[PDB]
């Protein structure tokens, strides 16, 4: 996550006028990384609240 | 009044700069060097096998097809190596090296003298002067001695 | 200043000492144009002009103080070439303006 | 170092050049090169009718503009 | 995963002109670096719901 956002910052610092075109890709990678966490978070919540 | 009797030329247009290339797909075999002191070249588009520059980040070495990079030259020595295996060392006073992917080098400097035109005896005298100048507590002399020592130390290291 | 037009005399030959100009931009404007032309693709907008997009990226790789030194160094070389060319043009046109006096 | 002292990159280059000119051997090349470091120039500006020096930017390299 | 997109930002900041030629490989890496995650998740979903 933070790698993605940090890269956006450093890229815009290297090329500000490109900052609008790099922000989409950032979000994409972000969400998908976060999505894995959610699945890792799904199991940990799927493993207690239903299983006997 | 005459309607713009004069129409001066742009002086930039009298020079012939390299045109950078994208995706050419060909690697040069030997670079085309061009070293310039204040205004006059010492070398004009010479075939060269390799070259070695000094910078503040450290010493770099350039060969054919080196990546496009533009950067300072720290005041020190500069080694050129021809295809015949010989070498040529030049002392410089700052500059900017402009490398090309196609294989072109423009090392624009303020001075360029071979090491052969320098004597260690005359250098030894300047060393203690610059050092004691760095010792004197005064901003006018300390910085000057620091700069002189900065250029002299690589010379004292290389002549040995 | 926002633009510096260094006028000088170019020595094309012993019988040809024409005018010439160096239109130097301002540092802040030069940096902004460098960025705006480094973003977009490489397309010359004037015949005889060279593309330098890789240079305008690699200078972005270069730190700030070094870019200011790049600007000042190259402007200094431009001024120096102007002074040398006018020196030679003076010494070449003086001969013509002296033989006609004779 | 010299950076925050106020002197520019170009005066630093000229000082390094002057040092290289000091150390190098006696010969024709030194005769060509001493010309490229020696200080002879000035500034001047016209008063109502007379000349006057603009000594705010000095030629000597140790000094700092103000 | 985000190492990939972050690198694409850094490259496009270095050479924006090349961005279009870099986006495939980026996606390509993401199409596979993420796949391994799925192959790590499938077990956890194939381990529980079918084994008694």
Structure, explained:
This is part of a larger assembly, with 2 copies of chain A (52 residues), 1 copy of chain B (160 residues), 1 copy of chain C (102 residues) and 1 copy of chain D (66 residues). Helices cover 79% and strands 0% of the residues of chain A. Chain A has a single domain, classed as F1FO ATP Synthase (Up-down Bundle), CATH 1.20.20. In chain A, α1 packs antiparallel against α2. Chain A is built from 2 helices and no strands. By secondary structure, chain B is of the alpha+beta class. The radius of gyration of chain B is 20 Å and the shape is globular. The N and C termini of chain B lie far apart (70 Å). Chain B folds into 2 domains: 95 residues, no CATH class; 42 residues, no CATH class. With 102 residues, chain C is of the alpha+beta class. A two-stranded antiparallel ribbon of chain C has the order 1-2. In chain C, α1 crosses α2. The longest helix of chain C is centred in the last third of the chain and has 36 residues. The radius of gyration of chain C is 18 Å and the shape is elongated. Chain D has one domain. Chain D has 2 helices and 2 strands, in the order ααββ.
Layout: helices, strands, pairs:
The structure is cut from a larger assembly and holds two copies of chain A (52 residues), one copy of chain B (160 residues), one copy of chain C (102 residues) and one copy of chain D (66 residues).
Chain A: H1 2-14, H2 19-46
Chain C: E1 3-13, E2 16-25, H1 27-39, H2 53-61, H3 64-99
Antiparallel strand pairs in C: 1-2
Helix pairs in contact in C: 1-2
Chain D: H1 9-23, H2 28-34, E1 45-46, E2 51-52
Antiparallel strand pairs in D: 1-2
PDB class: membrane protein
Keywords: mitochondria, ATP synthase, membrane protein
Entry title: Cryo-EM structure of Euglena gracilis mitochondrial ATP synthase, OSCP/F1/c-ring, rotational state 2
What is the compact description of this entry?
With 52 residues, chain A is an all-alpha fold. Chain A contains 2 helices and no strands.
Task: List SSEs of chain C in N-to-C order.
Answer: EEHHH
Number of helices of chain D: 2
Q: Output the strand order for the largest sheet of chain C.
A: 1-2
Largest sheet of chain C: 2 strands, antiparallel
Q: Distance N terminus to C terminus of chain C? A: 45 Å
* Share in helix of chain C: 55-70%
How many E strands of chain D? 2
Largest sheet of chain D: 2 strands, antiparallel
Note the overall shape of chain C: elongated
Most extensive interface: B-C, 26 and 34 residues
- Binned, the helix content of chain D reads 25-40%
Percent strand of chain C equals 15-25%
